[PDB]
Structure formats: structure tokens, C-alpha cells
Amino acid sequence: KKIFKPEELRQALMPTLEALYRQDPESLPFRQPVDPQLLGIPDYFDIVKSPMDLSTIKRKLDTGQYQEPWQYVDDIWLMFNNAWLYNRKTSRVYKYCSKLSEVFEQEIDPVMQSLGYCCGRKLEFSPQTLCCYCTIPRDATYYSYQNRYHFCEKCFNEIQGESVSLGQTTINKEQFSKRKNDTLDPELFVECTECGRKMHQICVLHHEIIWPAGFVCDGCLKKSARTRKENKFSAKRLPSTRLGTFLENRVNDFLRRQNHPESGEVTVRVVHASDKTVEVKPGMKARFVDSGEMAESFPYRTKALFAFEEIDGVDLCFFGMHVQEYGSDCPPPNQRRVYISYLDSVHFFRPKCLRTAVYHEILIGYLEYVKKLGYTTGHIWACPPSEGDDYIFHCHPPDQKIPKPKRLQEWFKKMLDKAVSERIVHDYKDIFKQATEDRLTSAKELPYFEGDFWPNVLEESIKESGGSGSQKLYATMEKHKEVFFVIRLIAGPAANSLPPIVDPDPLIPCDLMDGRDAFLTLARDKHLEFSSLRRAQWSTMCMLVELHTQS
Ligand SMILES: CCCC(=O)SCCNC(=O)CCNC(=O)[C@H](O)C(C)(C)COP(=O)(O)OP(=O)(O)OC[C@H]1O[C@@H](n2cnc3c(N)ncnc32)[C@H](O)[C@@H]1OP(=O)(O)O
Ligand SMILES: [Cl-]
Ligand SMILES: [Zn+2]
Ligand SMILES: [Zn+2]
Ligand SMILES: [Zn+2]
Ligand SMILES: [Zn+2]
């Protein structure tokens, strides 16, 4: 419907092209079509298969060859990427190109918005981290087979001879692709069904399941005084639980007491609950299970929960956590214990000044809740994610700093100190002090949680020592003590005569949220990043559809 008259486009876009032209000397290399012979570059057309330059763009613009402004934008970016492709990162033309692109980004965005568009930005997804069958860096050369087995240029030539082994089968090095990790997937567009304008799907938050009749831009809606049909796939409409309700009430009551300007309501939902078992690993099993001194496995309930806030009228998932709950039927040493498998956040909560406080309220609430059920003890491993890894949310904002261990430890201490002052937590200790207090003598007495540090270090210890599970145990606990919190919820004689633990909430099947892996995999496979407010809002919207529809 919306026809851009060629003069309309010329008038609107030519100032953005002039802005590039008037950059001296940066513009000069881009003002005329590359003549490879004259320029003393014969191999230019071996690399650059779609040449483009300012004159060609000016001409297409003057002669009405563009039907819509994104076609202009694509040519501009083709020109830039042609130069970034052919020239070295350290070269003259490369840096000139970079300068022009910065001028262009600043010029183009408000123009595109004047023409009725979401924005004028060129948007691409973050590059995935490539492992090594070690990790491969952005833009640096690497070797791959079936887009499945990749090797960094160093550890590839490390391999002696001409044959690699995958799995087992043997592959000649000549069968590997040599390539640079410089591939970035563009963001997708959706077309307004009325005016025909192409908009970033993430800018407009159009999801085909939620609005199956098709996308209609805000411009077109406002002209006829319409509004979008309600999004029924919201965080609020996910099923309530006793736990979720309790946590969200605690949070919102806290926010209401603070009365900070521009506070929003928080929604907390439990989205997974299932019964699982942790199996004792082979070292510890040979040592204690086979002689009947320790259970071969421990049953627990896993739960996944998320907190959401409305930001700019749209749901935003900002906090996530998975927990392991070992009930009263579980064998010692795990009986009546909870362990935090992992928690994660995306730092867009508003207001900023209460973000940490809100995370603390969620954790204190959770401790309070399980205490009420009759869980006696909480367990926290203060372990930051490894470099460029994510616990729950794929692709964090690059400006969200990741705490190192000391900061993270102090953060848990501040939470627990508040919990103590509220008389929820009786006390807490590091693992070494706790073991001392419990007169622990053997490794079989240490709580054994899925994915935790202690099961792994005990395997290593038994093997290193040639059969002892407990020789250096106090020394290992002392050495790592600052990182391991044991939290006493129910203290002393009362902890010995408790009734059975009965959880009033039902099980909640949801394979997507059975541990962290499935949601990380989904997010990676569908470009669901949490790396900016807009991408997190999209990713939240998609997550919520998935949670509503898989149920
Ligand atoms: C077995 C695992 C069990 C667990 O899951 S233990 C927790 C492991 N999970 C993670 O670390 C997930 C990634 N981290 C997060 O989502 C968050 O950092 C977390 C843990 C929820 C806490 O968030 P926040 O309450 O916002 O506290 P914070 O320490 O992250 O940030 C508060 C202020 O400290 C700053 N900060 C954090 N790391 C820093 C650094 N490395 N260098 C310098 N500054 C740093 C941060 O920028 C912030 O400053 P500001 O007050 O906003 O100016
Ligand atoms: Cl999607
Ligand atoms: Zn946009
Ligand atoms: Zn490598
Ligand atoms: Zn429209
Ligand atoms: Zn404030």
C-alpha cells in the first residue's frame, strides 16, 4: 500500500549519502567503482563478487531504482562489508570504512524513523562461541568438519600427522574446511500487512502465534485508532503455585514499602517441578555404596522458577533459578536439604537501585518457604559462571558485569545476614566450620547433590590417594571454604522430631525447564538472546509462548 515516490526517497535519503561524501579523506576510496587493474589489485573480483560504491548508490537514488529505503541501506552496508572483507583490519581503507559506517549509523536511524519505520539500524545477532574437540576466537581462522567438529588453528596443527580422530573414525586434514569465525546472522523482518513497511521483528515484537491474523504496525493502528489484540501468552497467565505466590507477594510487599518512583509489579512463576535422582559416581560408589555405607542414589524434586517485570508495556524475564529439594523420605546424608543448582539474572529490572534487594527477597522468601515445609538446611555453592558461559539466560548484555568469587560470596552473605535478622535463617557457616560443628569424620557424611563440586572432588581425591575418600577432606574443605555455605533453617532438637515433608504444590511437567540445558539450547537454536532490553523482551515473549503451548 504505502508507495514511496522516488522523489520522497531521494529527498529523505540523499542527505544521509551526502554525509558520507563530505568525509575527507575517508570517503575518497568509496566514491567511484573499484577499478582493480588501475588500483593495482587483480584479485579484488576473486573476493568481492557484488561491487558497490557511493556513485552507483547516488545514481540508483537519482534515477528511482529503489522501491523502499531498506534497499538503499543494504547497498550502503554492501559497500562497507566489501571493504571490511577485502582490506586488512590494520589497513587504511578499513579504518576509513569504519569511520563512514559510524557516520551512517548516526544519520540513518532518525531518517528511517521519519519514514514510518521502527528504526534504521543494521542489526545482526551475536556470534556463537565455537568450542574445540579450548575455544575459537571471533574473526580468527579455524578448521571444521561437517559444521560439527571444529579446531583452533593452534591445536589443529598440534595434531601430529595428517589424520584426525572424531567420536571412532579417521579424517584426513584435507577434508576440513578452513574458515574465519566472522559469520553473523541478520535480524529478521516482518512486513506490515497494511502499509507494506518491513520492520525488525524484535523492534515490533510480532509473534505469529500470538497475533495469527498478521502484523499491523503502530502507525497503521493509530491512524484508525486501533490497538493490538491482547497478548494472552503473558507471565501473569502462567499457572500459579503456592511457592510462586508466596515469593511474588514477598517481593511486591517489599516494593510497596520502598515506594520508589516508577516501580513495577513483579510476577514469580514456578514452571517446572519433577522428581529425579542423583546417582553416586563410580569412585564414591566403589568406596561406600558397595559396602552398604551409603545409598547408591538420592531422590529429590527439582524446580525451576522465574521472575518477570513489565517494562515499556511488555513482559521481561529478569531472574531465574533451579533448585534441588531432598525430602524427608530421602536417605541421609541428604535428608531435608535444599540446594541451589543455579541462578541467573538479566540486569534490566527497574528501578535499578532495588535490583539486588529484589533478588535477595526472592532468595530469602525461598529459604523461608522450604523452612516452613520442614526442610532443615540450605546449601549454596557461590560459583560464578566460567568466562563467556551462561547459567540460564543465553547471551547476557555485554555491559552486565559478572561477579568474581569474593563479590559473589559477599552478596550471598548480605542476603543471609538479612535472613538471619528476620529470624528465617538461624545461622550459617562455611562448609569447613559446619563439618567441624557436626563432628564429621567421613566423606560419606557430606551431602551429595547433582552437579555440585563435592561429588567431583571426591572422585578425584579417591583416585589421587589410591583409595581414601577422607584423608585430606578437612584440608580440602578448609581450602575452598569461602565458596560453600551451609544454612541452618531449623536448629537443634526440633530438627530431629519433624513430621513428614508434604509439598502442597503439584508436579509440573515441562521438559524445556528440566534443568538449564534445554532452555539454553532452545535460545541458541532460535536466536533468543538476553543481550539488550529489546532482545530480552523478544526472548521473554518467545519463552512465554513456549511455556504456554508445550503445557
Ligand atoms: C552452583 C551455582 C549456584 C549459583 O548459581 S551461585 C550464582 C551464580 N550465578 C551467576 O553468577 C549468574 C550471573 N550473575 C548474575 O546474574 C548476577 O550477578 C547476580 C548473581 C544475580 C547478582 O546480581 P546483582 O544483585 O546485580 O549484584 P552484582 O554483584 O552482579 O552487581 C552489583 C554491582 O557490582 C558490580 N559488579 C559485578 N561484577 C563486577 C565485577 N566483576 N567488577 C566490577 N564490578 C562488578 C555491578 O556492575 C554492580 O554495580 P552497580 O551497583 O550497578 O554500579
Ligand atoms: Cl522464534
Ligand atoms: Zn528496527
Ligand atoms: Zn583449540
Ligand atoms: Zn503499517
Ligand atoms: Zn533510586
From Swiss-Prot:
Binding residue positions for acetyl-CoA: L343, D344, S345, R355, T356, I402, R407, W411
GO BP of this protein: animal organ morphogenesis; apoptotic process; B cell differentiation; behavioral defense response; canonical NF-kappaB signal transduction; cellular response to L-leucine; cellular response to nutrient levels; cellular response to UV
GO cellular component, one term: protein-DNA complex
Location in or out of the cell: Cytoplasm; Nucleus; Chromosome
Post-translational modification: Acetylated on Lys at up to 17 positions by intermolecular autocatalysis.
Outcome of mutating Y342R: Loss of activity
Annotated ranges, domain Bromo: 4-111
Annotated segments matching region Interaction with histone: 342-344
Residue ranges of domain CBP/p300-type HAT in the record: 232-551
A GO molecular-function descriptor: STAT family protein binding
Superkingdom in the source lineage: Eukaryota
Modification type N6-acetyllysine: residues: K281, K418, K444, K472
Effect recorded for S341W: Loss of activity
Keywords: Acetylation, Acyltransferase, Biological rhythms, Bromodomain, Cell cycle, Chromosomal rearrangement, Chromosome, Citrullination, Cytoplasm, Disease variant, Host-virus interaction, Intellectual disability, Isopeptide bond, Metal-binding, Methylation, Nucleus, Phosphoprotein, Repeat, Transcription, Transcription regulation, Transferase, Ubl conjugation, Zinc, Zinc-finger
Domain remark from Swiss-Prot or TrEMBL: The CRD1 domain (cell cycle regulatory domain 1) mediates transcriptional repression of a subset of p300 responsive genes; it can be de-repressed by CDKN1A/p21WAF1 at least at some promoters. It contains sumoylation and acetylation sites and the same lysine residues may be targeted for the respective modifications. It is proposed that deacetylation by SIRT1 allows sumoylation leading to suppressed activity.
Function in brief: Functions as a histone acetyltransferase and regulates transcription via chromatin remodeling. Acetylates all four core histones in nucleosomes. Histone acetylation gives an epigenetic tag for transcriptional activation. Mediates acetylation of histone H3 at 'Lys-122' (H3K122ac), a modification that localizes at the surface of the histone octamer and stimulates transcription, possibly by promoting nucleosome instability. Mediates acetylation of histone H3 at 'Lys-18' and 'Lys-27' (H3K18ac and H3K27ac, respectively). (Microbial infection) In case of HIV-1 infection, it is recruited by the viral protein Tat. Regulates Tat's transactivating activity and may help inducing chromatin remodeling of proviral genes. Binds to and may be involved in the transforming capacity of the adenovirus E1A protein.
Clinical note on disease: Defects in EP300 may play a role in epithelial cancer.
Subunit structure, interactors included: Interacts with HIF1A; the interaction is stimulated in response to hypoxia and inhibited by CITED2. Probably part of a complex with HIF1A and CREBBP. Interacts (via N-terminus) with TFAP2A (via N-terminus); the interaction requires CITED2. Interacts (via CH1 domain) with CITED2 (via C-terminus). Interacts with CITED1 (unphosphorylated form preferentially and via C-terminus). Interacts with ESR1; the interaction is estrogen-dependent and enhanced by CITED1. Interacts with HIPK2. (Microbial infection) Interacts with human adenovirus 5 E1A protein; this interaction stimulates the acetylation of RB1 by recruiting EP300 and RB1 into a multimeric-protein complex.
Identification of the protein by name: Histone acetyltransferase p300
Source lineage: Eukaryota, Metazoa, Chordata, Craniata, Vertebrata
Gene this chain is encoded by: EP300
Span of the entire protein shown here: 1046 to 1662 of 2414
